[PDB]
Write an enzyme that holds these catalytic residues in place. Structure first.
Site, PDB file in Angstrom:
ATOM      1  N   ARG A 135      67.523  42.707  84.651  1.00  0.00           N
ATOM      2  CA  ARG A 135      66.654  43.882  84.693  1.00  0.00           C
ATOM      3  C   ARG A 135      65.922  44.027  83.377  1.00  0.00           C
ATOM      4  O   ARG A 135      66.508  43.826  82.309  1.00  0.00           O
ATOM      5  CB  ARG A 135      67.455  45.160  85.009  1.00  0.00           C
ATOM      6  CG  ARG A 135      67.777  45.223  86.463  1.00  0.00           C
ATOM      7  CD  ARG A 135      66.481  45.675  87.093  1.00  0.00           C
ATOM      8  NE  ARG A 135      66.275  45.245  88.466  1.00  0.00           N
ATOM      9  CZ  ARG A 135      65.079  45.272  89.048  1.00  0.00           C
ATOM     10  NH1 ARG A 135      64.030  45.730  88.372  1.00  0.00           N
ATOM     11  NH2 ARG A 135      64.922  44.844  90.292  1.00  0.00           N
ATOM     12  N   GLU A 164      56.266  46.013  84.854  1.00  0.00           N
ATOM     13  CA  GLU A 164      55.975  44.851  85.696  1.00  0.00           C
ATOM     14  C   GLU A 164      54.747  45.117  86.558  1.00  0.00           C
ATOM     15  O   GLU A 164      54.781  46.010  87.428  1.00  0.00           O
ATOM     16  CB  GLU A 164      57.193  44.482  86.549  1.00  0.00           C
ATOM     17  CG  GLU A 164      58.315  43.889  85.708  1.00  0.00           C
ATOM     18  CD  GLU A 164      59.569  43.581  86.495  1.00  0.00           C
ATOM     19  OE1 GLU A 164      60.557  43.146  85.861  1.00  0.00           O
ATOM     20  OE2 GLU A 164      59.568  43.753  87.737  1.00  0.00           O
ATOM     21  N   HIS A 182      58.999  37.978  88.082  1.00  0.00           N
ATOM     22  CA  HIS A 182      60.152  38.551  88.786  1.00  0.00           C
ATOM     23  C   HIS A 182      60.440  37.810  90.091  1.00  0.00           C
ATOM     24  O   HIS A 182      60.483  38.391  91.180  1.00  0.00           O
ATOM     25  CB  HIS A 182      59.960  40.054  89.038  1.00  0.00           C
ATOM     26  CG  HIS A 182      61.244  40.782  89.305  1.00  0.00           C
ATOM     27  ND1 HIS A 182      61.399  42.133  89.081  1.00  0.00           N
ATOM     28  CD2 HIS A 182      62.441  40.338  89.760  1.00  0.00           C
ATOM     29  CE1 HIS A 182      62.631  42.492  89.398  1.00  0.00           C
ATOM     30  NE2 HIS A 182      63.285  41.422  89.809  1.00  0.00           N
TER      31      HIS A 182
END
Ligand SMILES: CC(=O)c1cccc(NS(=O)(=O)c2ccc(C(=O)Nc3nc(-c4cccc(F)c4)cs3)cc2)c1
Length: 190
Positions: A135, A164, A182
């Site tokens: 994370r 993000e 990601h």
């Protein structure tokens, strides 16, 4: 699910050890820079695993097959339990100076935001390589950049960011940073 993140993590470790993303970019730029990309053999090196839930354990058993010494910390798991899957648990302060590679697999909690920061980076071996496929925020991004600029951190692999997509490009653009948008769970099987 968990295996997709563990597999990406192990792939990031390999890419840091052998600079594959950088080497591929160099080749596509028409260069043949064999000397610049002298890498690291993983056998016999120490991997620190912070967070020993399912994904941390999966990373451990994969990287053990490479001959890595796997140490780690998890305040929920006892050292006897971690020994059963081959991770030697030590106090965090004993972990930092021993690691050649560090990978984080904790939830994002108050206790784990900035787990790697200016203080703990300074406790690491000079040239530590760091992976965050968990994370964004577990590794303090400002501290990471400072460690990369000084050489305290020789390289970082980031799948996740505090924002993000990231708006600050300093980490992504650094020559010793490899990154993905990601992709941790981005397999058809997952
Ligand atoms: C296998 C087994 O017999 C057994 C025994 C008991 C419980 C479980 N369950 S579990 O394996 O699913 C599991 C679930 C959650 C966690 C976890 O929350 N870990 C955390 N670490 C930090 C952490 C903070 C600071 C530094 C740092 F490095 C880490 C914060 S929270 C860990 C493991 C399994």
């Amino acid at each position: 699910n968990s295996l997709s993140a563990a597999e990406l993590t192990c792939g990031m470790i390999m890419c840091l050890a052998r600079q594959i993303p950088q080497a591929t970019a160099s080749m596509k730029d028409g260069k043949w820079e064999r000397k610049k990309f002298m890498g690291t053999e993983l056998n016999g090196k120490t991997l620190g695993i912070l967070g020993l839930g399912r994904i941390g354990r999966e990373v451990a058993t994969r990287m053990q097959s490479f001959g890595m010494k796997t140490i780690g910390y998890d305040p929920i798991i006892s050292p006897e339990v971690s020994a059963s899957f081959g991770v030697q648990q030590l106090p965090l302060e004993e972990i930092w100076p021993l690691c050649d590679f560090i990978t984080v697999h904790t939830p994002l909690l108050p206790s784990t935001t900035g787990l790697l920061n200016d203080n703990t980076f300074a406790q690491c071996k000079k040239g530590v390589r760091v992976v965050n496929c968990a994370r964004g925020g577990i590794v303090d991004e400002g501290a990471l950049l400072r460690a990369l600029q000084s050489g305290q951190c020789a390289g970082a692999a980031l799948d996740v960011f505090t924002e993000e997509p990231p708006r600050d490009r300093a980490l992504v653009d650094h020559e010793n940073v490899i990154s993905c948008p990601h992709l941790g769970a981005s397999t058809k099987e997952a």
